[PDB]
Design a protein around this ligand. Structure first.
Ligand SMILES: Cc1cc2nc3c(=O)[nH]c(=O)nc-3n(C[C@H](O)[C@H](O)[C@H](O)COP(=O)(O)OP(=O)(O)OC[C@H]3O[C@@H](n4cnc5c(N)ncnc54)[C@H](O)[C@@H]3O)c2cc1C
Ligand SMILES: Cc1cc2nc3c(=O)[nH]c(=O)nc-3n(C[C@H](O)[C@H](O)[C@H](O)COP(=O)(O)OP(=O)(O)OC[C@H]3O[C@@H](n4cnc5c(N)ncnc54)[C@H](O)[C@@H]3O)c2cc1C
Lengths: 115, 115
């Protein structure tokens, strides 16, 4: 019944997706070369530190075969959603509909339910 | 009443501290030069992308005056806790007792309440 405990696999995963999908969602539509390199390095280093040894190792391999597209906010947000669906599929979870990433992570549901 | 909405300032902040304090907590006790450089760069780039413009700008300045100590897991976990207390103080929040960072973010309360 305590909420101030060390996040387990699932809780840390939920926090980490929230972070990553939020950062993606406010990444520029026209990022500078520096911002593109910087964001590719961010996700690279994040993968180096992600503390679940199983989780992080699959993620490093998954990224070796699938480099972050940081060209634009659109490409990077979709890329990240496609990355997340790969882990969802791994875990038996359904795909998240990536045409929804903007509503979910930046703008809110179009029907108004986050108001 | 929806939990799948875009995190506001406070929710993203809570996710982001969870991430950062969890990553810190599993950082090596004897990190290699590479791991030290990599973690200093991670926090640097994180500060570049943190999407609250006010929040992120204070954080970049706060880091210019206070560079991440990534020498060891102990120094980095304490450093991060001291960084977090600076934001808590800014916001009128009490200091978190940094001798507790291990219980809170890795091992669980010593009294057994995360079991
Ligand atoms: C980088 C990373 C790698 C991980 N690797 C593993 C692993 O190898 N093995 C393992 O057991 N766990 C892994 N996890 C943890 C795992 O993915 C989940 O976070 C955890 O299992 C809790 O799942 P959940 O059902 O609450 O939803 P989560 O998968 O945590 O998703 C959180 C929320 O994000 C939204 N969402 C879901 N999919 C997408 C999408 N594709 N795009 C945009 N938004 C989405 C939904 O609103 C959902 O409620 C990993 C987590 C991360 C961040
Ligand atoms: C890097 C960063 C910079 C931010 N800058 C601003 C800003 O400039 N202005 C603004 O309004 N908001 C800022 N925020 C958001 C803000 O700090 C809080 O996250 C948010 O206000 C919600 O606060 P909270 O009371 O739920 O606890 P949080 O501050 O979100 O803390 C979450 C939990 O962490 C634990 N904790 C608290 N302090 C520490 C500590 N020092 N060390 C270890 N664990 C701790 C406690 O268990 C607490 O419940 C920032 C967030 C981050 C991650």
């Amino acid at each position: 019944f305590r909420e101030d405990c060390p996040p387990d696999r699932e809780e840390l995963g939920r926090h980490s997706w929230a972070v990553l999908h939020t950062l993606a969602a406010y990444y520029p539509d026209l990022p500078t070369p520096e911002q593109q390199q910087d964001m590719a390095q961010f996700i690279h280093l994040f993968s180096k530190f992600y503390p679940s040894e199983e989780s992080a190792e699959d993620l490093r391999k998954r990224l070796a075969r699938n480099h972050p597209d940081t060209r634009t906010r659109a490409a990077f947000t979709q890329w990240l959603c496609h990355l997340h669906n790969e882990v969802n599929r791994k875990l038996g979870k359904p795909d998240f509909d990536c045409s929804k990433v903007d509503e979910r992570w930046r703008d809110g549901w179009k029907d108004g339910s986050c108001d």
